[PDB]
Amino acid sequence: MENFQKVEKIGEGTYGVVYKARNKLTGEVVALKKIRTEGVPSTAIREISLLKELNHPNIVKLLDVIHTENKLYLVFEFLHQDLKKFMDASALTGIPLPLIKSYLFQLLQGLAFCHSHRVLHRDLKPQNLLINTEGAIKLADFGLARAFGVPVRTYTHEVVTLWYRAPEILLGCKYYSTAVDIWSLGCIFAEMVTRRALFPGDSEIDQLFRIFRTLGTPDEVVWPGVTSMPDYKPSFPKWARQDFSKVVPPLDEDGRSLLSQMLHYDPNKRISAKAALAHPFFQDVTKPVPHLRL
């Protein structure tokens, strides 16, 4: 750490505490994440290391991976604000549609890039979407999920957010696909629009039932194979699907259409990041600048 000039805490991540730090030599200001060890898995080291090559305007750059004394530190490019803070800040008037559309468009490009490289996020949420004064938005922590493992109960017992988890994950499918990220982003899109989380579950079953209550309990017609999923129970209540117009008012039909394809139950039917970028909803996309108070 003596390589940095007085580092200061700025939050708690899934794996550990996140600090803002300045490199004593380069003068560069960066984000420093200490990963919470049994000597740290070599398997994880090589996988995380590969992410250093994933460069894209909409992906938070992984600068370095430092392994020392059973300790793993990840050095990332620093951005001053996250979408969760920005949404809370925009709570009164709501984020303007052009800015919501620009952010969604950029996030889909970031997802398309990662997915075309066989890298999945698996834990997307407003907190790991960082923005800057230029109107850019970037995905943070891509690939860390598969690199390490699924969350459970951190040293700080930090309550893991389930709000953006895809249904196939909740129903016990062990083989996650790129579709889980599209689901999460759909949930985030809905949240920017309505200013309220779409599915704020307080437990895994409550999360699943909130999804069922809004999109309808899935069956073999809409999701072939769903009744044979590991955690599926014939006892799940059967809720009828609600009208999308009631889901994200007052989003227009282009937006409602895209969200519906992002929220398809069948991971195989769910729209890919690539196809989503070509949806009519983005026909008039622009890049407005947000008003950030740093």
Coordinates of C-alpha atoms in Angstrom, one line a residue:
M1 CA 0.0 0.0 0.0
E2 CA 3.0 2.3 0.5
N3 CA 2.7 2.6 -3.3
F4 CA -0.4 4.8 -2.8
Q5 CA -0.9 8.2 -1.1
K6 CA -3.4 8.0 1.8
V7 CA -6.1 5.7 0.5
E8 CA -9.6 6.3 1.8
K9 CA -12.6 4.0 2.1
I10 CA -15.6 4.6 -0.1
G11 CA -17.7 1.6 0.3
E12 CA -18.2 -2.2 0.8
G13 CA -18.4 -4.5 -2.2
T14 CA -19.5 -8.1 -2.5
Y15 CA -15.9 -9.3 -2.1
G16 CA -14.5 -6.6 0.2
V17 CA -14.0 -3.0 1.0
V18 CA -13.5 -0.5 -1.9
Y19 CA -11.0 2.4 -1.6
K20 CA -10.2 5.5 -3.6
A21 CA -6.4 5.9 -3.9
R22 CA -3.7 7.9 -5.6
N23 CA -0.6 6.1 -6.9
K24 CA 2.4 7.8 -5.3
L25 CA 4.4 7.4 -8.5
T26 CA 2.0 7.9 -11.4
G27 CA -0.2 10.3 -9.5
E28 CA -3.2 8.4 -10.9
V29 CA -6.4 8.3 -8.8
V30 CA -7.9 4.7 -8.9
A31 CA -10.4 2.5 -7.2
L32 CA -8.9 -0.2 -5.0
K33 CA -10.8 -3.4 -4.2
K34 CA -9.4 -5.8 -1.6
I35 CA -10.9 -9.3 -2.3
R36 CA -11.7 -11.2 0.9
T37 CA -8.0 -16.2 2.6
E38 CA -7.0 -19.9 2.3
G39 CA -4.0 -18.7 0.3
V40 CA -6.2 -17.5 -2.6
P41 CA -7.1 -19.9 -5.4
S42 CA -4.6 -20.0 -8.3
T43 CA -7.6 -20.9 -10.6
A44 CA -9.2 -17.5 -9.7
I45 CA -5.9 -15.6 -10.2
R46 CA -5.5 -16.6 -13.8
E47 CA -9.2 -16.0 -14.6
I48 CA -9.2 -12.5 -13.0
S49 CA -6.0 -11.8 -14.8
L50 CA -7.5 -12.5 -18.2
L51 CA -10.1 -9.7 -17.5
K52 CA -7.2 -7.2 -17.7
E53 CA -7.5 -7.5 -21.5
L54 CA -11.2 -6.7 -21.6
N55 CA -11.1 -3.1 -22.8
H56 CA -14.3 -1.3 -23.9
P57 CA -15.6 2.3 -23.4
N58 CA -18.5 0.9 -21.4
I59 CA -16.6 -1.5 -19.2
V60 CA -14.8 -0.2 -16.1
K61 CA -11.1 -0.8 -16.8
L62 CA -9.3 -3.4 -14.7
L63 CA -5.8 -1.8 -14.4
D64 CA -4.0 -4.3 -12.2
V65 CA -4.4 -7.5 -10.1
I66 CA -2.1 -7.6 -7.1
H67 CA -1.7 -10.8 -5.2
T68 CA 0.2 -10.6 -1.9
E69 CA 0.2 -12.3 1.5
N70 CA -2.9 -14.4 0.8
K71 CA -4.3 -11.1 -0.3
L72 CA -5.8 -10.1 -3.6
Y73 CA -6.3 -6.4 -4.6
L74 CA -8.0 -5.3 -7.8
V75 CA -7.1 -1.9 -9.2
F76 CA -9.8 -0.3 -11.3
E77 CA -10.2 3.0 -13.2
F78 CA -12.1 5.4 -10.9
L79 CA -15.4 7.1 -11.6
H80 CA -17.1 9.5 -9.2
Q81 CA -20.7 8.2 -9.1
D82 CA -22.9 5.1 -9.5
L83 CA -26.4 4.8 -11.0
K84 CA -27.9 4.0 -7.6
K85 CA -26.8 7.4 -6.2
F86 CA -27.8 9.1 -9.4
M87 CA -31.3 7.6 -9.4
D88 CA -31.8 8.6 -5.7
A89 CA -30.6 12.1 -6.7
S90 CA -32.9 12.2 -9.6
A91 CA -35.8 10.9 -7.5
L92 CA -37.9 14.2 -7.7
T93 CA -38.0 14.7 -11.4
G94 CA -36.9 11.3 -12.7
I95 CA -34.1 10.7 -15.2
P96 CA -35.1 12.2 -18.6
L97 CA -36.0 9.6 -21.2
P98 CA -33.2 10.6 -23.5
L99 CA -30.7 10.0 -20.7
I100 CA -32.3 6.7 -19.7
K101 CA -32.2 5.6 -23.4
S102 CA -28.5 6.7 -23.8
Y103 CA -27.6 4.8 -20.6
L104 CA -29.4 1.6 -21.6
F105 CA -27.9 1.8 -25.1
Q106 CA -24.3 2.1 -23.7
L107 CA -25.0 -0.7 -21.2
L108 CA -26.2 -3.0 -23.9
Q109 CA -23.0 -2.2 -26.0
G110 CA -20.9 -3.1 -22.9
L111 CA -22.9 -6.3 -22.5
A112 CA -22.6 -7.2 -26.2
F113 CA -18.8 -6.8 -26.0
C114 CA -18.4 -8.9 -22.8
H115 CA -20.8 -11.6 -24.1
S116 CA -19.1 -11.8 -27.5
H117 CA -15.9 -12.6 -25.4
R118 CA -17.7 -15.2 -23.4
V119 CA -17.6 -13.1 -20.2
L120 CA -20.8 -12.8 -18.1
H121 CA -21.5 -10.4 -15.2
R122 CA -24.1 -12.5 -13.3
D123 CA -24.6 -9.8 -10.6
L124 CA -25.6 -6.6 -12.3
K125 CA -27.2 -3.9 -10.2
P126 CA -27.3 -0.1 -10.1
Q127 CA -24.4 0.0 -7.7
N128 CA -22.0 -1.4 -10.2
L129 CA -23.0 0.9 -13.0
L130 CA -20.7 3.9 -12.8
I131 CA -21.2 7.3 -14.6
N132 CA -19.1 10.4 -15.2
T133 CA -19.7 14.0 -16.2
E134 CA -19.3 13.2 -19.9
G135 CA -22.5 11.2 -20.1
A136 CA -20.8 7.9 -20.1
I137 CA -21.9 4.9 -18.1
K138 CA -19.8 1.8 -17.5
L139 CA -20.2 -1.8 -16.1
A140 CA -18.1 -2.6 -13.1
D141 CA -17.1 -6.1 -11.8
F142 CA -17.7 -8.1 -15.0
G143 CA -16.4 -11.6 -14.8
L144 CA -15.7 -11.6 -11.1
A145 CA -18.7 -13.9 -10.4
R146 CA -17.4 -16.9 -12.4
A147 CA -13.8 -16.0 -11.5
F148 CA -14.6 -16.6 -7.8
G149 CA -18.0 -17.9 -6.8
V150 CA -21.6 -17.1 -5.9
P151 CA -22.3 -14.8 -2.9
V152 CA -23.6 -16.2 0.4
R153 CA -22.8 -14.4 3.6
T154 CA -19.8 -12.0 3.5
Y155 CA -17.5 -11.4 6.5
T156 CA -19.7 -8.4 7.1
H157 CA -22.9 -10.4 6.4
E158 CA -23.7 -7.7 3.9
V159 CA -27.2 -8.5 2.6
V160 CA -26.9 -9.7 -1.0
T161 CA -29.4 -8.0 -3.3
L162 CA -31.6 -10.4 -5.1
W163 CA -33.8 -7.8 -7.0
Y164 CA -32.1 -8.2 -10.3
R165 CA -31.6 -12.0 -10.3
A166 CA -33.0 -13.9 -13.4
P167 CA -35.7 -16.5 -12.8
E168 CA -33.6 -19.5 -14.0
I169 CA -31.0 -18.6 -11.3
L170 CA -33.7 -18.5 -8.6
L171 CA -35.1 -21.9 -9.9
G172 CA -31.8 -23.6 -9.5
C173 CA -30.4 -23.8 -13.0
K174 CA -26.7 -24.4 -12.5
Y175 CA -25.6 -23.4 -16.0
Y176 CA -26.1 -19.6 -16.3
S177 CA -26.0 -17.9 -19.7
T178 CA -25.6 -14.4 -21.1
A179 CA -29.4 -14.1 -20.7
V180 CA -29.1 -13.5 -16.9
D181 CA -27.4 -10.2 -17.6
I182 CA -30.1 -9.1 -20.0
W183 CA -32.7 -9.9 -17.3
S184 CA -30.9 -7.8 -14.7
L185 CA -30.5 -4.9 -17.2
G186 CA -34.2 -5.1 -18.0
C187 CA -35.0 -4.7 -14.2
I188 CA -32.6 -1.7 -14.1
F189 CA -34.2 -0.1 -17.2
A190 CA -37.7 -0.5 -15.5
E191 CA -36.3 1.1 -12.3
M192 CA -34.9 4.1 -14.1
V193 CA -38.3 4.6 -15.7
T194 CA -40.5 4.2 -12.7
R195 CA -38.1 5.3 -10.0
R196 CA -38.9 2.2 -8.0
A197 CA -37.2 -1.2 -8.1
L198 CA -39.2 -3.6 -10.2
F199 CA -38.9 -6.7 -8.1
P200 CA -37.7 -5.8 -4.6
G201 CA -37.7 -9.3 -3.1
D202 CA -36.6 -9.7 0.5
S203 CA -35.8 -13.5 0.2
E204 CA -35.2 -15.9 -2.7
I205 CA -38.8 -17.1 -2.7
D206 CA -40.2 -13.6 -2.2
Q207 CA -38.1 -12.5 -5.3
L208 CA -39.5 -15.4 -7.3
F209 CA -43.1 -14.7 -6.3
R210 CA -42.8 -11.0 -7.0
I211 CA -41.7 -11.9 -10.5
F212 CA -44.5 -14.5 -10.8
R213 CA -47.1 -11.9 -9.6
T214 CA -46.2 -9.5 -12.3
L215 CA -45.2 -11.6 -15.3
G216 CA -47.5 -14.6 -14.4
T217 CA -46.4 -17.9 -13.0
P218 CA -44.4 -19.6 -15.8
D219 CA -45.7 -22.9 -17.3
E220 CA -44.6 -25.3 -20.0
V221 CA -46.3 -23.2 -22.7
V222 CA -44.2 -20.0 -22.2
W223 CA -41.1 -21.7 -20.7
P224 CA -40.5 -25.3 -22.0
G225 CA -38.7 -27.2 -19.3
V226 CA -39.5 -24.9 -16.4
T227 CA -41.5 -27.5 -14.4
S228 CA -38.4 -29.7 -14.4
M229 CA -36.1 -27.1 -13.0
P230 CA -34.2 -28.1 -9.7
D231 CA -36.2 -25.8 -7.4
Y232 CA -39.5 -25.7 -9.2
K233 CA -42.5 -26.8 -7.1
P234 CA -45.8 -27.9 -8.5
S235 CA -47.1 -26.1 -5.4
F236 CA -46.1 -22.6 -6.7
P237 CA -49.3 -20.4 -6.8
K238 CA -50.5 -19.7 -10.3
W239 CA -50.7 -16.0 -10.8
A240 CA -52.0 -14.5 -14.1
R241 CA -49.7 -12.2 -16.0
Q242 CA -50.3 -8.4 -15.6
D243 CA -50.4 -5.9 -18.5
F244 CA -47.1 -4.3 -19.3
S245 CA -48.8 -0.9 -19.5
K246 CA -49.3 -1.3 -15.8
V247 CA -45.7 -2.4 -15.3
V248 CA -43.7 0.6 -16.4
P249 CA -46.0 3.5 -16.9
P250 CA -45.7 5.8 -18.7
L251 CA -43.0 4.3 -20.9
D252 CA -44.0 4.3 -24.6
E253 CA -44.7 1.2 -26.7
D254 CA -41.2 1.0 -28.1
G255 CA -39.8 0.9 -24.6
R256 CA -42.4 -1.5 -23.3
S257 CA -41.7 -3.8 -26.2
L258 CA -38.0 -3.9 -25.6
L259 CA -38.4 -4.4 -21.9
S260 CA -40.8 -7.4 -22.6
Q261 CA -38.2 -9.1 -24.7
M262 CA -35.6 -8.5 -22.0
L263 CA -37.9 -10.1 -19.4
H264 CA -38.9 -13.2 -21.3
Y265 CA -39.0 -16.2 -18.9
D266 CA -37.3 -18.5 -21.3
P267 CA -33.6 -17.6 -21.2
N268 CA -33.5 -19.0 -24.8
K269 CA -36.2 -16.6 -26.0
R270 CA -34.8 -13.6 -24.0
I271 CA -33.4 -10.9 -26.4
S272 CA -29.5 -10.8 -26.7
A273 CA -27.6 -7.6 -26.1
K274 CA -26.8 -7.5 -29.8
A275 CA -30.4 -7.8 -31.0
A276 CA -31.6 -5.3 -28.4
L277 CA -29.3 -2.6 -29.8
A278 CA -31.2 -2.8 -33.0
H279 CA -34.6 -2.4 -31.4
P280 CA -36.7 0.6 -32.7
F281 CA -36.6 2.1 -29.2
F282 CA -33.0 3.3 -30.0
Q283 CA -33.8 4.8 -33.3
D284 CA -33.6 8.4 -31.8
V285 CA -30.9 7.7 -29.3
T286 CA -28.5 10.5 -28.3
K287 CA -25.9 11.2 -25.7
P288 CA -27.1 13.9 -23.2
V289 CA -24.8 14.9 -20.3
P290 CA -26.1 14.4 -16.8
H291 CA -25.9 17.1 -14.2
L292 CA -23.8 15.6 -11.5
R293 CA -23.0 17.2 -8.2
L294 CA -19.7 15.7 -7.1

